[PDB]
Design an enzyme around this catalytic site. Structure first.
Site, PDB file in Angstrom:
ATOM      1  N   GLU C  62       0.848  -1.187   0.000  1.00  0.00           N
ATOM      2  CA  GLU C  62       0.000   0.000   0.000  1.00  0.00           C
ATOM      3  C   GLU C  62       0.885   1.240   0.000  1.00  0.00           C
ATOM      4  O   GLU C  62       1.712   1.399   0.908  1.00  0.00           O
ATOM      5  CB  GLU C  62      -0.928  -0.038   1.210  1.00  0.00           C
ATOM      6  CG  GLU C  62      -2.039   1.002   1.221  1.00  0.00           C
ATOM      7  CD  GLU C  62      -1.610   2.351   1.750  1.00  0.00           C
ATOM      8  OE1 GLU C  62      -0.686   2.408   2.584  1.00  0.00           O
ATOM      9  OE2 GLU C  62      -2.222   3.352   1.334  1.00  0.00           O
ATOM     10  N   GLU C 245      26.044 -15.380  19.351  1.00  0.00           N
ATOM     11  CA  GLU C 245      26.104 -15.941  20.697  1.00  0.00           C
ATOM     12  C   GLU C 245      24.773 -15.836  21.419  1.00  0.00           C
ATOM     13  O   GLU C 245      24.717 -15.410  22.576  1.00  0.00           O
ATOM     14  CB  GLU C 245      27.204 -15.254  21.500  1.00  0.00           C
ATOM     15  CG  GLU C 245      28.609 -15.477  20.966  1.00  0.00           C
ATOM     16  CD  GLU C 245      29.659 -14.715  21.754  1.00  0.00           C
ATOM     17  OE1 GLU C 245      30.832 -14.691  21.326  1.00  0.00           O
ATOM     18  OE2 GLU C 245      29.310 -14.141  22.808  1.00  0.00           O
TER      19      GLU C 245
HETATM   20  N1  GDP Z   1      39.818 -10.724  34.198  1.00  0.00           N
HETATM   21  C1  GDP Z   1      39.025 -10.432  33.139  1.00  0.00           C
HETATM   22  N2  GDP Z   1      38.047 -11.305  32.794  1.00  0.00           N
HETATM   23  C2  GDP Z   1      37.228 -11.056  31.745  1.00  0.00           C
HETATM   24  C3  GDP Z   1      37.420  -9.818  30.983  1.00  0.00           C
HETATM   25  N3  GDP Z   1      36.493  -9.815  30.008  1.00  0.00           N
HETATM   26  C4  GDP Z   1      35.772 -10.954  30.138  1.00  0.00           C
HETATM   27  N4  GDP Z   1      36.206 -11.695  31.172  1.00  0.00           N
HETATM   28  C5  GDP Z   1      35.646 -13.001  31.592  1.00  0.00           C
HETATM   29  O1  GDP Z   1      35.498 -13.845  30.452  1.00  0.00           O
HETATM   30  C6  GDP Z   1      34.237 -14.517  30.476  1.00  0.00           C
HETATM   31  C7  GDP Z   1      33.649 -14.508  29.073  1.00  0.00           C
HETATM   32  O2  GDP Z   1      34.610 -15.033  28.161  1.00  0.00           O
HETATM   33  P1  GDP Z   1      34.504 -14.720  26.588  1.00  0.00           P
HETATM   34  O3  GDP Z   1      34.697 -13.248  26.332  1.00  0.00           O
HETATM   35  O4  GDP Z   1      33.176 -15.183  26.035  1.00  0.00           O
HETATM   36  O5  GDP Z   1      35.713 -15.570  25.949  1.00  0.00           O
HETATM   37  P2  GDP Z   1      35.777 -15.813  24.355  1.00  0.00           P
HETATM   38  O6  GDP Z   1      34.610 -16.668  23.929  1.00  0.00           O
HETATM   39  O7  GDP Z   1      37.065 -16.520  24.014  1.00  0.00           O
HETATM   40  O8  GDP Z   1      35.720 -14.485  23.641  1.00  0.00           O
HETATM   41  C8  GDP Z   1      33.353 -13.773  31.463  1.00  0.00           C
HETATM   42  O9  GDP Z   1      32.773 -14.696  32.390  1.00  0.00           O
HETATM   43  C9  GDP Z   1      34.264 -12.806  32.192  1.00  0.00           C
HETATM   44  O10 GDP Z   1      34.284 -13.111  33.587  1.00  0.00           O
HETATM   45  C10 GDP Z   1      38.510  -8.914  31.418  1.00  0.00           C
HETATM   46  O11 GDP Z   1      38.736  -7.840  30.820  1.00  0.00           O
HETATM   47  N5  GDP Z   1      39.243  -9.282  32.473  1.00  0.00           N
HETATM   48 MG    MG Z   2      -1.461  -1.421   5.394  1.00  0.00          MG
END
Ligand code: GDP
Ligand code: MG
Ligand code: GTP
Ligand code: GTP
Ligand code: MG
Lengths: 430, 71, 430, 430
Positions: C62, C245
């Site tokens: 439309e 994801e």
């Molecule tokens: N110490 C720390 N842990 C992190 C950071 N970013 C994410 N995480 C941990 O990593 C987990 C998620 O992992 P993810 O990013 O999915 O790993 P990938 O799948 O390899 O990218 C979460 O439970 C966070 O606790 C960070 O900057 N520092």
């Molecule tokens: Mg319509």
């Protein structure tokens, strides 16, 4: 000589490395432009451990950065000390894994890993005398926990005599950020025990607890957790880069802390840690360091170390101090706590002294202890895994990429067998 | 026939040939005609109408081509 | 190198697309003419010199709404020949837009989709918007989804459908085409989000304090939800989440992918600054049953998995301290086979405000996407409404005479019965 | 030292010659008076001081068009006595222009051809233009080709014939003379290009968005195609192509030399600059069946060889990366005995724009000359049209009374049957 290369994967590993390399560069006086501006002669004698030399006199880390998505490495480059990394070592895909272990280990991670293995082989073949590899990755993500662990097996198959380190962050049930954490944690622990020479578990929950209780800072961020992990990482290899009374490389720790080849899961801790307002009150002495070193809340894991008995322990003192005091204090910490030390192996504490303290501190200690209390983490991980798997929840995502439930059953059985045989020695008596 | 079969096999993942359709209903109207409409996501076939009886037998070969759901 | 394509079909779809496209242009600094006076690449494309072109296509049979678009202030933004328009409306008849007039238009739309896809290199997935209770919207959405599912295969598609309210309705025949479209997208869409108008009316009345809302106020809230969902792809964050994801974290089984959303805070500038808007209170408000974006009661069913996004200056430890409080409460209970059910994302960019709009500027916000067992009530009530008129075969002649077969109504009823049985089977404890 | 002579016969031929001769004069900077206010030598000749004279000759028996030419703005350009004109028109009768009035005019044309050829030193070949569905055009074209084939021999001649549309037609008797002229030029012309009006009407309607086109708009597109074909002889290029390098690349067998052309991009200035016009998208548009310059479907037949010309700032690697994509597609299939079928030419000079015209100024363009097996459909439909009226011998008395024999119609039918059998015999795989 006896140098190691750095390999990191996933977002968590990349963020850990982004602070580990900053800490190392600040320790060795390397500016973010790769130019040395240090003060002491010792700052350059053993720089070949972590840094390579290029024309023009600048230094470049021998690090390899891999991920299945380009965002994290495109972000770490703009951060401080981001220019040190060689652009050639950046390898990435265009799709990502989506926290799915199967995609990052069977379908997508298998095709990409050839390019990163090429640069890994280039780095290892060239170096003077290889000591080994150290790996930083997270068990809570798909691409990391898949590609890193498959790379572990590929590296082990080609260098069976070298040593292998892994700093692994396992998903705690308290602070959960992903619903599919148990699946890729359980699948990864299965492969990790078979190939890693050393493994060091780190938990975000324990880091938050430490930051809230010992440092008493109001608003923790990932930068503080990364800084603590980086200090702990640097403390292990300090005596390999500096002179000391009793030098002890990684292989010497491997000999003295692993009684049986399958028991190589340690939990660590760093001392001293004090708040900003109380940094003037405290006086740094060996008793003060050793009382905080064995403190239960100081461990980098939520596992409670007085719920089990230590099989062995290690300490890496830093700074200039008397050895007699260190030995007597180690004896005293073992006589007053005889109930928490296994009795059929006497004198189960290793000590080492390095004369070069961290920048800004006069004394520091890194603690690495192999204890039976680590069983609780695998118990809860397996409990969540079996609670979720019995209904076949989220199983189709994994089974649609060539994986089956048999590999889940074998992984669960092997993990439970590890849990059982790790505590078998807790009740063993002479 | 070979080129038509090749075009069909390039577009579809499988074929089901249905033959000898026997309809039995709990009640037929004796004055009513019945036909079967055989359908999937890709099309439909119709039988010739037959007069209602205790069992009706529809003759024909019905080639049903699939691209996903096999219903 | 990450891209996404949004599809807008029907009057409601186009009117919410306009709402989201003011917001994106405002958030990336692009003027309505398309000229700036590297994050834009997710939604836009660079033409080489000057203007940016949205990665969006507008569909309708439309012509009134498209003609209104092509004369407003945004006439210069969209490419002239991606606003596909028909001549004759489907007039709320589903069979028309699936069998009679939609087939002659769908080829041009597919050609445009191909021409847009060949430009992208890292295509994450598709977004689609369509009001379900209309002829052209539901019919063309079904046909486009069915064509895309076979042209591209495993690429992810997300559907922001607007189901009719429990009692409030604008048409009289919308249950028929709602049921048929649910049949069509049940086996063809990876994610479907609930968006009925009555709940959002109540939200506006209670929080925004507007007693006479129009469709624009609803569409602005929907646009804010979309921006919060897709912020993680184009801004730096401590804990990133990608579109791929999701089926690994929110979708336990392939059939179950209908979930309902919520947003917080929603408050006007007249009383926003009098209260501190802490993270704990906003995450409590997000879980309130009265703040659901779809008129369903979560207290009537279990939760399966919760994916909830933050943005602003939020710190992860404060997020964990609030997830613990929610796990504590006795009025919110999760399913037995899911020990942890939270996926958390944190982003740094605060939500942007649209001038002349309702929402004020705040530094913290939370958007939750939650999959719960209570969603079966809307299916049951739609089924009851359908059965009442299908008993007497009312309004069926308007559908049989447009090429659709008589038996096509029954199998949609059988699929809804199967879905309702599946939702009951999943929610029982082991 | 490279030259080419263009022959224009009939009303359509003269009207397309005018169209190409504004374009050439504009492209080489020559004013309509012939005065400039070393690339011109291909089409022009220097008179020693001042003006340039085209290497073209205009033929017609009906004086109106020539008189219009000799009074327009281009009266000063052409040599006064190379615009050969007759007194009596052939009136759509082929036998007239081949047996009755064309013979008395052909001698003057041949004398002019000799006088133009003695001036050239590096004569590449001849070009000829003639609308086939007319008496004088087809008849005089046939007679001139037959005289030239024996006067000069191996010199190459190219024919840009305009066949009638499938259903749209201006005359009622054009199949007869179309078939006879195809008979005549089948064994006498090296290249024949298809140019029916209906396809170009559809191109104008869809792309140029003109709803009321006239013949000038069609002739401008044809002129652009001619300029693109002959650009490589008078401009520097990275990959040059000559006229003599065609029968070695596009003509598998001496009988098969009818091919159909396409051009891209075709777009107006109102929406041209909103999109980037990359080489990949233009080379995709050129292969679209709806953009064929003759109303034939390439999906109905195989390809034999494709010769396609680029001009502008195109880089060869981008061309190869786009040829690979086309080889990938499943809807375009080449003949079995031809593994590679592409000949690529690259030129640096961008296409020139004519003021007040339809096309806008762009930096990249592509012109393809493709030989395909699907061309047999036009022959089959023309044959079917011919048979219907030849069954009852309708309109034959208008041809028998102009000196042509009765049996001359049958042998053209036999040659068309032979050509159709040959096209079927070639297209079968081994
Ligand atoms: N110490 C720390 N842990 C992190 C950071 N970013 C994410 N995480 C941990 O990593 C987990 C998620 O992992 P993810 O990013 O999915 O790993 P990938 O799948 O390899 O990218 C979460 O439970 C966070 O606790 C960070 O900057 N520092
Ligand atoms: Mg319509
Ligand atoms: N949230 C929201 N819903 C809308 C809006 N406009 C229409 N709707 C809903 O759409 C339903 C009917 O479908 P429409 O989108 O209006 O019309 P259509 O989808 O184009 O189908 P046709 O009637 O054939 O043109 C109504 O029941 C409304 O509830 C809108 O602006 N916002
Ligand atoms: N493309 C194109 N075709 C034309 C044009 N003018 C005429 N034709 C075609 O030419 C056919 C008839 O031949 P004409 O060129 O008009 O006349 P002729 O060739 O001089 O033959 P006579 O009728 O004897 O004068 C018609 O069917 C038209 O399709 C033109 O300007 N452009
Ligand atoms: Mg004429």
């Amino acid at each position: 000589m006896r140098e190691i290369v750095h390999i990191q994967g996933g977002q968590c590993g990349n963020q850990i490395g982004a602070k580990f390399w900053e800490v190392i560069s600040d320790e060795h006086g390397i500016d973010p432009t790769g130019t040395y501006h240090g003060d002491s002669d010792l700052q350059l004698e053993r720089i070949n451990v972590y840094y390579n030399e290029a024309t023009g006199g600048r230094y470049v880390p021998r690090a390899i950065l891999m991920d299945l998505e380009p965002g994290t490495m495109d972000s770490v480059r703009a951060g401080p000390f981001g220019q040190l990394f060689r652009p050639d070592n950046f390898v990435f895909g265009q799709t990502g894994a989506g926290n799915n272990w199967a995609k990052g280990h069977y379908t997508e991670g298998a095709e990409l890993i050839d390019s990163v293995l090429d640069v890994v082989r280039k780095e290892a073949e060239g170096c003077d005398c290889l000591q080994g590899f150290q790996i930083t990755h997270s068990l809570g993500g798909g691409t990391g926990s898949g590609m890193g662990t498959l790379l572990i097996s590929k590296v082990r198959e080609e260098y069976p005599d070298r040593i292998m380190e892994t700093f692994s962050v396992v998903p705690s049930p308290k602070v959960s950020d992903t619903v599919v954490e148990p699946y890729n944690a359980t699948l990864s622990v299965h492969q990790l025990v078979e190939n890693a020479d050393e493994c060091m578990v780190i938990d975000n929950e324990a880091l938050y607890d430490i930051c809230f209780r010992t440092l008493k800072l109001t608003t923790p961020t990932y930068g503080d957790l990364n800084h603590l992990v980086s200090a702990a990482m640097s403390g292990v290899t300090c005596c390999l880069r500096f002179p000391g009374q009793l030098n002890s490389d990684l292989r010497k720790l491997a000999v003295n802390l692993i009684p049986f080849p399958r028991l190589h899961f340690f939990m660590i801790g760093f001392a001293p840690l004090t708040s900003r307002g109380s940094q003037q009150y405290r006086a740094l002495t060996v008793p003060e360091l050793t009382q905080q070193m064995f403190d239960a809340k100081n461990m980098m894991c939520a596992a409670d170390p007085r719920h089990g008995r230590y099989l062995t322990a290690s300490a890496l003192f830093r700074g200039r101090m008397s050895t007699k005091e260190v030995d007597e204090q180690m004896l005293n910490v073992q006589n007053k706590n005889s109930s928490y030390f296994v009795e059929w192996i006497p004198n189960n504490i290793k000590s080492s002294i390095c004369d070069i303290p961290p920048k800004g501190l006069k004394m520091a200690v890194t603690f690495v202890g192999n204890s039976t209390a680590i069983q609780e983490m695998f118990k809860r991980v397996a409990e969540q895994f079996t609670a979720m798997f019995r209904r076949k929840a989220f199983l189709h995502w994994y089974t649609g990429e060539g994986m089956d439930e048999m590999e889940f059953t074998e992984a669960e059985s092997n993990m439970n067998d590890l849990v059982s045989e790790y505590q078998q020695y807790q009740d063993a008596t002479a | 026939n070979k080129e038509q079969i090749k075009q069909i096999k390039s577009k579809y993942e499988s074929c089901l040939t249905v033959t000898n359709l026997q309809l039995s209903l709990d009640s037929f109207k004796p004055e009513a005609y019945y036909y079967l409409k055989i359908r999937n996501s890709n099309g439909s076939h119709k039988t010739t109408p037959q007069n209602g009886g205790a069992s009706m037998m529809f003759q024909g070969d019905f080639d049903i081509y699939f691209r996903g759901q096999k219903i | 190198m990450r891209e996404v394509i949004s599809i807008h079909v029907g009057q409601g779809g186009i009117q919410v697309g306009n709402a989201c496209w003011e917001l994106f242009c405002l958030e990336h600094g692009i003027q309505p003419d398309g000229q700036m006076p590297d994050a834009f690449n997710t939604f836009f494309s660079e033409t080489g010199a000057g203007k940016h072109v949205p990665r969006a296509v507008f569909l309708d049979l439309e012509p009134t709404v498209i003609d209104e678009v092509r004369t407003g202030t945004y006439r210069q933004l969209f490419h002239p020949e991606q606003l596909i328009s028909g001549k004759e409306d489907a007039a709320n008849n589903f069979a028309r837009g699936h069998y009679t007039i939609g087939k002659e238009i769908v080829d041009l739309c597919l050609d445009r989709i191909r021409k847009l896809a060949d430009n992208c290199t890292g295509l994450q997935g598709f977004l689609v918007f369509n009001s379900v209770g209309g002829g052209t919207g539901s019919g063309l959405g079904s046909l486009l989804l069915e064509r895309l599912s076979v042209d591209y295969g495993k690429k992810s598609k997300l559907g922001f459908t607007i189901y009719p309210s429990p009692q409030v309705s604008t048409a009289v025949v919308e249950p028929y085409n709602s049921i048929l479209s649910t049949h069509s997208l049940l086996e063809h869409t990876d994610v479907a989000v609930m968006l009925d108008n009555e709940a959002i009316y109540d939200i506006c009345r209670r929080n925004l304090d507007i007693e006479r809302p129009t469709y624009t106020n609803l569409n602005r809230l929907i646009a804010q939800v979309i921006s919060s969902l897709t912020a993680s792809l184009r801004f730096d964050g401590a804990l990133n989440v990608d579109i791929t994801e999701f089926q690994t974290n929110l979708v336990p089984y392939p059939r179950i992918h209908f979930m309902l959303s919520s947003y917080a805070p929603i408050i006007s500038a007249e009383k926003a600054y009098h209260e501190q808007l802490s993270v704990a209170e906003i995450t409590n408000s997000a879980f309130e049953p009265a703040n659901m974006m779809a008129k369903c009661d979560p207290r009537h069913g279990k939760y399966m998995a919760c994916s909830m996004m933050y943005r602003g200056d939020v710190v992860p430890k404060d997020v964990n301290a609030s997830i613990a409080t929610i796990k504590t409460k006795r009025t919110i209970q999760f399913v037995d086979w899911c020990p942890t059910g939270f996926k958390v994302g944190i982003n740094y960019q605060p939500p942007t405000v649209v001038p002349g709009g309702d929402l004020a500027k705040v530094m913290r916000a939370v958007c939750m996407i939650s999959n719960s067992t209570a969603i079966a009530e809307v299916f049951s009530r739609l089924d009851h409404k359908f059965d009442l008129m299908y008993a007497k075969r009312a309004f069926v002649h308007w559908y049989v005479g447009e090429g659709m077969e008589e038996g096509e109504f029954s199998e949609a009823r059988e699929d809804l019965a199967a879905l309702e049985k599946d939702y009951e089977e999943v929610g029982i404890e082991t």
